[PDB]
Amino acid sequence: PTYTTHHLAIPSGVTQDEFDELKQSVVEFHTYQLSQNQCSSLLAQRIRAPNDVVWSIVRRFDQPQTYKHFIKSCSVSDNFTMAVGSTRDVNVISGLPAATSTERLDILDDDRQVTGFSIIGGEHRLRNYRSVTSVHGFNRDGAICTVVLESYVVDVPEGNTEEDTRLFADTVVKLNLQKLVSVAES
Amino acid sequence: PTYTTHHLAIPSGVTQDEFDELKQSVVEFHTYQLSQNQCSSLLAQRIRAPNDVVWSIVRRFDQPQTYKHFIKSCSVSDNFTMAVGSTRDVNVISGLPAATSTERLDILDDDRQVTGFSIIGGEHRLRNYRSVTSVHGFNRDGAICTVVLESYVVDVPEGNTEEDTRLFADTVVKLNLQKLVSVAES
Ligand SMILES: CC1=CC(=O)CC(C)(C)[C@@]1(O)/C=C/C(C)=C\C(=O)O
Numbered sequence: 001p002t003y004t005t006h007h008l009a010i011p012s013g014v015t016q017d018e019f020d021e022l023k024q025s026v027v028e029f030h031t032y033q034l035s036q037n038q039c040s041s042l043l044a045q046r047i048r049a050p051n052d053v054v055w056s057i058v059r060r061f062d063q064p065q066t067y068k069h070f071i072k073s074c075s076v077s078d079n080f081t082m083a084v085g086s087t088r089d090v091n092v093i094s095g096l097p098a099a100t101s102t103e104r105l106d107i108l109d110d111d112r113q114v115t116g117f118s119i120i121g122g123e124h125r126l127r128n129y130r131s132v133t134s135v136h137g138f139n140r141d142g143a144i145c146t147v148v149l150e151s152y153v154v155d156v157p158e159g160n161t162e163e164d165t166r167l168f169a170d171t172v173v174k175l176n177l178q179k180l181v182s183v184a185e186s
Numbered sequence: 187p188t189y190t191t192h193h194l195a196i197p198s199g200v201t202q203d204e205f206d207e208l209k210q211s212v213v214e215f216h217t218y219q220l221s222q223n224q225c226s227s228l229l230a231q232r233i234r235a236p237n238d239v240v241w242s243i244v245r246r247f248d249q250p251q252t253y254k255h256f257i258k259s260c261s262v263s264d265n266f267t268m269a270v271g272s273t274r275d276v277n278v279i280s281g282l283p284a285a286t287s288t289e290r291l292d293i294l295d296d297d298r299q300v301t302g303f304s305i306i307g308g309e310h311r312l313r314n315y316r317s318v319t320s321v322h323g324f325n326r327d328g329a330i331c332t333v334v335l336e337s338y339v340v341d342v343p344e345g346n347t348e349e350d351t352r353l354f355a356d357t358v359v360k361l362n363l364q365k366l367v368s369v370a371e372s
Pocket residue numbers: 068070092100101119122124125126129131168169172173176
């Protein structure tokens with residue numbers, strides 16, 4: 001297989017010196033295998049809030065709607081455990097209506113403050129979506145100011161271009177990351 | 187089959203005293219006919235920028251991608267004039283890909299700073315979408331503050347609920363208005 005090189009390109013929204021400190025985290029957590037039909041991207045967002053505050057929000061695998069747009073509801077089983085392997089049924093706002101993507105929790109590491117999930121079933125064109133989010137505290141002069149890194153890999157549907165698929169997924173993650181800013185600042 | 191009454195309910199983001207000044211504009215420009223299969227909503231967004239600056243952005247019928255998300259490109263004909271009746275072809279970012287909704291300019295009023303459009307062709311579920319944006323300057327402690335009002339009417343697709351459709355359309359418009367804030371305040 002072929003692998004991503006997100007450590008070679010500073011994403012927008014981070015400085016060269018901030019990024020230099022995070023390259024180790026990108027390699028460890030934001031590297032995916034790449035098939036010929038896949039694309040992957042890494043996004044970043046600075047947040048004026050303690051990383052412990054941010055981690056506590058994004059850790060909530062059962063309540064993504066608190067920090068994501070376009071989710072009407074999210075339910076988990078009555079025996080849900082916050083553990084690798086638990087799943088959720090996400091009801092998406094799209095005008096179809098109440099669509100559903102079942103997602104499985106892949107990583108939950110409270111020591112490094114990293115989580116991630118993969119989409120394992122649903123009615124959509126984002127087949128084999130996999131995402132990782134890591135939380136990073138910086139003593140940042142009035143904050144712990146946190147940079148959140150979020151990357152994904154996904155299949156490019158036949159009849160889609162890689163740029164088109166990537167542009168859509170990038171737009172969603174960027175918009176959700178802006179919402180995370182609003183929620184974290186309190 | 188009656189008409190909308192958005193002048194009767196204050197939208198979020200406005201004060202009662204601010205809204206009282208806008209009721210005449212809501213009546214004059216933000217009233218739609220409503221059939222039993224349609225819904226309509228009215229949104230507002232405060233912007234710390236001169237109303238003339240905001241107006242110059244939202245007036246650009248040929249360039250919605252400057253202030254809206256999820257638009258890959260926008261083309262108009264070689265004889266395009268910025269005039270009621272002109273149309274544009276919008277290529278939407280959706281993961282389908284490069285989708286298209288053809289839109290017609292309905293209002294372009296430079297004295298009152300109102301613009302509006304209706305969707306006249308495309309491949310989607312926002313049938314008979316019609317939208318109006320109006321710009322409003324307020325003197326606030328020596329600086330101009332702009333309120334943008336944006337409303338729409340749209341058909342509810344069979345199998346959708348009104349809340350679900352409204353929720354989606356409300357989500358899109360609000361997000362486009364946040365991008366408008368960034369562009370105007372830069
Ligand atoms: C918003 C939405 C609409 C779709 O059509 C596909 C899917 C259900 C995957 C999705 O939830 C996509 C979500 C994305 C890209 C990222 C995320 O959630 O962090």
